[PDB]
Subunit: 31 residues, 4 copies
């Protein structure tokens, strides 16, 4: 995989993805 950037103009919507990102990233840390 590579490094991708998701620039979102706003604030609330950015938080929404931030949540789906906290869980997904949590799966990689799962152990």
């Amino acid at each position: 995989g590579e490094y991708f950037t998701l620039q979102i103009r706003g604030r609330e919507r950015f938080e929404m993805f931030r949540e789906l990102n906290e869980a997904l990233e949590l799966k990689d840390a799962q152990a």
Copy 2:
């Protein structure tokens, strides 16, 4: 919290949410 239903008409989009759902639910199972 209560039980909510997200009926999505399609197939690919439903999978997208299915992923964000696999991680979030994984956080509740984390331990």
Copy 3:
């Protein structure tokens, strides 16, 4: 496509997906 159900146990997380669902569904209504 068919009809799928996304049952999420909680309330805030359900809203998150609800937003991504309002826009996607908005694309289908776009015209």
Copy 4:
């Protein structure tokens, strides 16, 4: 609102958010 960046390490997950981003951004273009 301001400009936020969502750097996700991977490729498929980045696409998932890319979809929820295509619709949300589509709502701002709706008119």
